[PDB]
Amino acid sequence: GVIRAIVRAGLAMPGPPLGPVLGQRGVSINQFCKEFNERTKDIKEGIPLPTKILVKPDRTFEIKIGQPTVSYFLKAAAGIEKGARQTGKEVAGLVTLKHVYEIARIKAQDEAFALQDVPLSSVVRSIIGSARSLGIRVVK
RNA sequence: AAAAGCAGCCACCAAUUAAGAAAGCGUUCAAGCUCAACACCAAAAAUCCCAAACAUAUAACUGAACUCCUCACACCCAAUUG
């Protein structure tokens, strides 16, 4: 019916997360990989991009890609790749306010990513809480 | 190389208008099914089980050599004794 993937854009086509996991349901991996590579080339690579693949009963696909994620997104915005081993103890990310405003503004895009709130405060609160759960803390 | 929500540890925020970084079930692994919440909502052993038997007429009856009623009283213990 519907599957949710998070394979990295730059990553061409692995095996487990796109081979047997999908073969059990019968698919055409060629077209899926081609569309994924096209969407990856359409924008700078090196960032995960979710997707809402719509598996039709006629063995046809209609991929629906979106904006980057939140984990790696904030990890790259703060400047640290690997996260903390124990949070919130092992602090790491220390983001200011202007960067948070900018990242929230550029994230406020795809409606499929839960954008049922008119103001942006409610939306940015979610990513702020997610960062708090991570080894990142909001400065100022 | 993997556990993403349950091989192991951390904090467990918070957007859905209004509620789990997940309380179970099932997944190598994700897939699927529920829940927390919201909208009216005790019996068994060998000859054969063993007293008939009734729930609905007024709390009181029956029941000794125990006590009493007429008379006179020494006349219900092993061994032993007087």
Ligand SMILES: [Mg+2]
């Ligand atoms: Mg007498």
